[PDB]
Design a protein around this motif. Structure first.
Motif, PDB file in Angstrom:
ATOM      1  N   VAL A   1       0.849  -1.186   0.000  1.00  0.00           N
ATOM      2  CA  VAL A   1       0.000   0.000   0.000  1.00  0.00           C
ATOM      3  C   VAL A   1       0.887   1.238   0.000  1.00  0.00           C
ATOM      4  O   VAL A   1       2.053   1.204   0.412  1.00  0.00           O
ATOM      5  N   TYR A   2       0.316   2.334  -0.504  1.00  0.00           N
ATOM      6  CA  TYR A   2       0.978   3.631  -0.576  1.00  0.00           C
ATOM      7  C   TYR A   2       2.369   3.533  -1.207  1.00  0.00           C
ATOM      8  O   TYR A   2       3.287   4.272  -0.833  1.00  0.00           O
ATOM      9  N   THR A   3       2.516   2.633  -2.193  1.00  0.00           N
ATOM     10  CA  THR A   3       3.840   2.278  -2.705  1.00  0.00           C
ATOM     11  C   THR A   3       4.547   3.475  -3.338  1.00  0.00           C
ATOM     12  O   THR A   3       5.741   3.696  -3.098  1.00  0.00           O
TER      13      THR A   3
ATOM     14  N   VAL B   1       3.491   6.926  -3.415  1.00  0.00           N
ATOM     15  CA  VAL B   1       2.914   8.244  -3.131  1.00  0.00           C
ATOM     16  C   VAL B   1       3.977   9.341  -3.137  1.00  0.00           C
ATOM     17  O   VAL B   1       3.695  10.477  -3.539  1.00  0.00           O
ATOM     18  N   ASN B   2       5.208   9.032  -2.722  1.00  0.00           N
ATOM     19  CA  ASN B   2       6.240  10.058  -2.723  1.00  0.00           C
ATOM     20  C   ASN B   2       6.696  10.406  -4.150  1.00  0.00           C
ATOM     21  O   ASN B   2       7.074  11.560  -4.418  1.00  0.00           O
TER      22      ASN B   2
ATOM     23  N   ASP C   1      -1.920   5.044   9.835  1.00  0.00           N
ATOM     24  CA  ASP C   1      -2.472   5.019   8.493  1.00  0.00           C
ATOM     25  C   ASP C   1      -2.265   6.352   7.798  1.00  0.00           C
ATOM     26  O   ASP C   1      -1.991   6.400   6.589  1.00  0.00           O
TER      27      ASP C   1
ATOM     28  N   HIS D   1       1.562   6.741   7.003  1.00  0.00           N
ATOM     29  CA  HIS D   1       1.823   5.809   5.909  1.00  0.00           C
ATOM     30  C   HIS D   1       1.250   6.333   4.592  1.00  0.00           C
ATOM     31  O   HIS D   1       1.934   6.330   3.565  1.00  0.00           O
ATOM     32  N   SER D   2       0.004   6.812   4.610  1.00  0.00           N
ATOM     33  CA  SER D   2      -0.605   7.363   3.401  1.00  0.00           C
ATOM     34  C   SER D   2       0.117   8.611   2.933  1.00  0.00           C
ATOM     35  O   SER D   2       0.019   8.963   1.758  1.00  0.00           O
TER      36      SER D   2
ATOM     37  N   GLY E   1       3.327   8.737   2.824  1.00  0.00           N
ATOM     38  CA  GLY E   1       4.651   8.332   2.404  1.00  0.00           C
ATOM     39  C   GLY E   1       5.719   8.266   3.477  1.00  0.00           C
ATOM     40  O   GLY E   1       6.910   8.333   3.133  1.00  0.00           O
TER      41      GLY E   1
ATOM     42  N   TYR F   1       6.424   0.400   5.382  1.00  0.00           N
ATOM     43  CA  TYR F   1       5.508   0.799   6.441  1.00  0.00           C
ATOM     44  C   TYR F   1       5.163  -0.353   7.362  1.00  0.00           C
ATOM     45  O   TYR F   1       4.883  -0.137   8.555  1.00  0.00           O
TER      46      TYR F   1
ATOM     47  N   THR G   1      -2.111  -4.095   6.975  1.00  0.00           N
ATOM     48  CA  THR G   1      -1.889  -2.660   6.850  1.00  0.00           C
ATOM     49  C   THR G   1      -2.677  -1.925   7.923  1.00  0.00           C
ATOM     50  O   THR G   1      -3.685  -2.423   8.434  1.00  0.00           O
TER      51      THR G   1
END
Ligand SMILES: O=C(CCC(=O)NCCc1ccc(Cl)c(Cl)c1)NCCCCNc1nc2cc(C(=O)O)ccc2c2cnccc12
Length: 330
Positions: free
Chosen positions: A9-11, A13-14, A143, A146-147, A149, A209, A312
């Motif tokens: 997840v959120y792989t 985002v950055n 969360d 993590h979301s 990044g 994460y 997650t």
């Protein structure tokens, strides 16, 4: 070599952010003057910091000052930029100011003050509901970051403030927090021993994460079983032995073989052969009031060698363990 791994997840985002969001090495810091704050008393000391209660003289507001011990200027920019990026997020401690003492010139962070509770009295009166309520609140903070990044990498009881009179929780010390980037190989010498994920203990560096969710599982296990810490290891290697005696060694070895990890020559002679234990073995009369099928089901889904198969943050918040706390929040 080792088999790659990506957060599931959120792989990315950055990568979709503007460079300045995560390129903290070029963040320009505007250093205020610590003479806006008068130190009242010392609250704690760590490897990287001394923390003080202080007064903002302009408005008499109670505040917290973290005087940073001398780290690479890099790492201070990192913590500031992470704090600035997470500002206003749910249950994340708010950074109020960035200052330097005018004489010593050393850098310090000013944080919001949380009116903590007698934790000695807290853990002797904890209800099943209290553990589920505050676990949920920590998950909201994980969360979110993590979301955004960002991995916290130092989840442990010391880094959770709770104002129980107000059921208010804050996740603190982002000094080890780091930006997640797919394929990056991170330092494993992070977090505290008792909460280090197996990926840190076997020197698997391409983690993500999900490292925080192991740490959360260590917290859960010590609360509900009233055993702190849950895995009490003498050193880093004996830490994995303590884990092996519970999660079993078949599974640890599948984990090694799956990611093609080269295991230290120290470990061969100390990990032994151990069965995966049933969680019932840690229940007794003095902790049964906090243990339930849903508690154990949720704990078991956090404590997995394979980082990729742990829950997650968001999956964790949808577990039945939290059904009644989710209901009451509406
Ligand atoms: O007191 C404890 C034990 C924390 C503790 O056991 N909590 C309860 C665990 C727990 C219990 C039940 C459940 Cl159910 C769950 Cl899940 C978890 N540790 C703190 C000592 C250090 C000094 N304290 C402050 N350090 C700050 C550092 C920063 C930073 O570095 O960013 C930012 C702000 C502060 C701060 C703000 N306001 C007041 C004090 C401080």
């Amino acid at each position: 070599g080792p088999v790659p791994s990506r957060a599931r997840v959120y792989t990315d985002v950055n990568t979709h952010r503007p460079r300045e969001y995560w390129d903290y090495e070029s963040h320009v810091v505007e250093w205020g003057n610590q003479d806006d704050y008068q130190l009242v008393r010392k609250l704690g000391r760590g490897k990287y910091s001394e923390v003080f209660e202080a007064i903002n003289i302009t408005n008499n507001e109670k505040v917290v000052v973290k005087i940073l011990k001398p780290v690479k200027k890099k790492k201070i920019k990192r913590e500031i930029k992470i704090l600035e990026n997470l500002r206003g997020g749910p249950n994340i401690i708010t950074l109020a100011d960035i200052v330097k003492d005018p004489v010593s010139r050393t850098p310090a962070l000013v944080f919001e003050h949380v009116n903590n509770t007698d934790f000695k009295q807290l853990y002797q009166t904890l209800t099943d509901y209290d553990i589920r309520f505050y676990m949920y609140e920590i998950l909201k903070a994980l969360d979110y970051c993590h979301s955004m990044g960002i991995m916290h990498r130092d989840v442990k009881p010391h880094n959770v403030m709770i104002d129980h009179e107000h059921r208010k929780l804050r996740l603190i010390d982002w000094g080890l927090a780091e930006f997640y980037h797919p394929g990056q190989e991170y330092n494993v010498r992070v977090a505290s021993r008792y909460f280090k994920g197996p990926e840190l203990l076997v020197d698997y560096q391409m983690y993500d994460y999900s490292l925080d969710m192991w740490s959360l599982g260590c917290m859960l296990a010590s609360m509900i079983f009233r055993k702190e810490p849950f895995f009490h290891g003498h050193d880093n290697y004996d830490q994995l032995v303590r884990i092996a005696k519970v999660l079993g060694t078949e599974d640890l070895y599948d984990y090694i073989d799956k990611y093609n990890i080269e295991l230290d020559p120290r470990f061969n002679d100390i990990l032994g052969r151990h069965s995966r234990k049933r969680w019932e073995r840690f229940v007794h009369s003095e902790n049964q009031h906090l243990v339930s099928p849903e508690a154990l089901d949720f704990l078991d889904k956090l404590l997995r060698y394979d980082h990729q198969s742990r829950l997650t943050a968001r999956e964790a918040m949808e577990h039945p363990y939290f059904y009644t706390v989710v209901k009451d929040q509406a």
